[PDB]
Amino acid sequence: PIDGTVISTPVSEGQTVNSNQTTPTIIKVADLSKMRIKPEISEGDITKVKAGQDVTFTILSDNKTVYHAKIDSVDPATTTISDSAV
Amino acid sequence: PIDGTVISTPVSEGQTVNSNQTTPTIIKVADLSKMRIKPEISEGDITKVKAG
Amino acid sequence: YGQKATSLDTLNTAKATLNNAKAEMDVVQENIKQAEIEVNTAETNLGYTKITSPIDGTVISTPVSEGQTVNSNQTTPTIIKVADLSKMRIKPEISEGDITKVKAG
Amino acid sequence: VKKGDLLAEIDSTTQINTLNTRKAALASYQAQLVARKTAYDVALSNYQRLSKL
């Protein structure tokens, strides 16, 4: 369906499949020219967190890279609805 | 089915589905102009808790 | 019919009742086909007479029992597991903070 | 993998055999058209005249 690049491949060339009942995923292809990070953002901060907000972040593999991005928009539903401790 | 707004979207534009066996939910659309909170209310208070 | 009489009503028999003969034979061609076809597919649903081993590498599992019923319509019963043991490949788990660094070759 | 690209393949056999099937069907239905039309020609030029007379 897309080009982005290849990210999984659960299949075996030589392998029987059974798609009548549930749909066998075969290759997983998503877009790696952009990416998108999903900030978990707890139930008491959200009254405050708004869309387009001078964010910053850092890779758990960087001693200072410090990324200068921006919040882009809001979900209306928890991280368990969208796509206890909440 | 309704307007309320959109609250989930478990699908992928490009994705095979298999609705014969169990029904694939595709988008989740519920009403965000009102809301309703559900007070858990324990087995010993309920003889008391009344409506309105 | 060039011999003056033989009323057209009996030439027309012959015309249309030639084409009906011819065409009723075509139908039986396409039927000959469909039968040859559905018979080859009826031996190609008879591919399954060794369950041939896709590769040689060697044998690594065998979950089956000679004498055992199977039910492949719903989900596909794996029967033997055959993978290649002349090479091998090791999969280094490699944690989320080293990967900015780990490169290929 | 550029959009719409070469990835997989299965046993297309059963499915092409039945494609060939369904194109034989047709391939005879047109051959019915042949006769089930000339029969009407023989019975259009029979009638269009016999009625005039």
- Chain D residues interacting with chain C (CB cutoff of 8 angstroms): 13-14, 17-18, 20-21, 24-25, 27-28, 31-32, 34-35, 38-39, 41-43, 45-46
CB atoms within 10 A of CB C30: 19
Solved with: X-ray
CA distances, A48 to each of A38, A74, A85, B21, D40 (Å): 17, 11, 18, 43, 82
Angle between helices C11-44 and D13-42 (to 10 degrees): 170
Please report which residue ranges of A1-86 form alpha helices under DSSP H: none
- Resolution to 1 decimal, in Å? 3.5
Could you tell me if B28 lies within 8 Å of chain A, comparing CB atoms? Answer: yes
CA C34/CA C42 separation, integer angstroms: 12
D17-25 contacts, C-beta under 8 A, 24 or more apart: D17/C37, D17/C38, D17/C40, D17/C41, D17/C44, D18/C41, D20/C33, D20/C37, D21/C34, D21/C37, D21/C38, D24/C30, D24/C33, D24/C34, D24/C37, D25/C30, D25/C34
Q: How is residue C64 written in tokens?
A: 């089956």
Query: If you count them, how many residues does chain D have?
Result: 53
Q: How is residue C84 written in tokens?
A: 């290649």
Nearest Cα residue to A39 out of A18, A56, A25, A20: A56
CA C70/CA D51 separation, integer angstroms: 72
CA of A39 vs chain D CAs: smallest distance (Å): 29
Cβ proximity of A46 and A73 under 8 Å: no
CA C78/CA C86 separation, integer angstroms: 23
Cβ proximity of A25 and A10 under 8 Å: yes
HEC assignment per residue over chain C: CCCCCCCHHHHHHHHHHHHHHHHHHHHHHHHHHHHHHHHHHHHHCCCCCCCCCCCCCCCCECCCCCCCCCCCCCCCCCCCECCCCCCCCCCCCCCCCCCCCCCCC
Cβ proximity of C27 and D28 under 8 Å: yes
Contact A18 C74 (CB under 8 A): yes
Q: Which of D14, D31, D41 sits opposite C23 (nearest CB)?
A: D31
Q: Which residues of C touch A60 (CB under 8 A)?
A: 96-97
Sign of the four-CA dihedral C21, C27, C30, C36? negative
Residue C27: half-sphere exposure toward Cβ, Cα within 13 Å: 13
CA of D9 vs chain A CAs: smallest distance (Å): 9
Query: If you count them, how many residues does chain C have?
Result: 105
Q: How is residue A50 written in tokens?
A: 């708004």
Nearest Cα residue to C101 out of B39, B28, D9, A60: A60
Cβ neighbours for C97, distance < 8 A, ≥ 6 positions apart: A60, A61
Sign of the four-CA dihedral D45, D51, D52, D53? positive
Using CB atoms, list chains with 3+ pairs below 8 Å to chain C: A, D
CA B22/CA A19 separation, integer angstroms: 14
Nearest Cα residue to D30 out of C30, C33, C17: C30
Residue C79: half-sphere exposure toward Cβ, Cα within 13 Å: 16
- Give the SS3 label for residue D22: helix
Most distant CA pair in chain C: distance in Å? 103
The region that residue B13 occupies, defined by phi over 0 for left and psi between -120 and 50 for alpha, beta otherwise, is: beta
Cβ proximity of A29 and D1 under 8 Å: yes
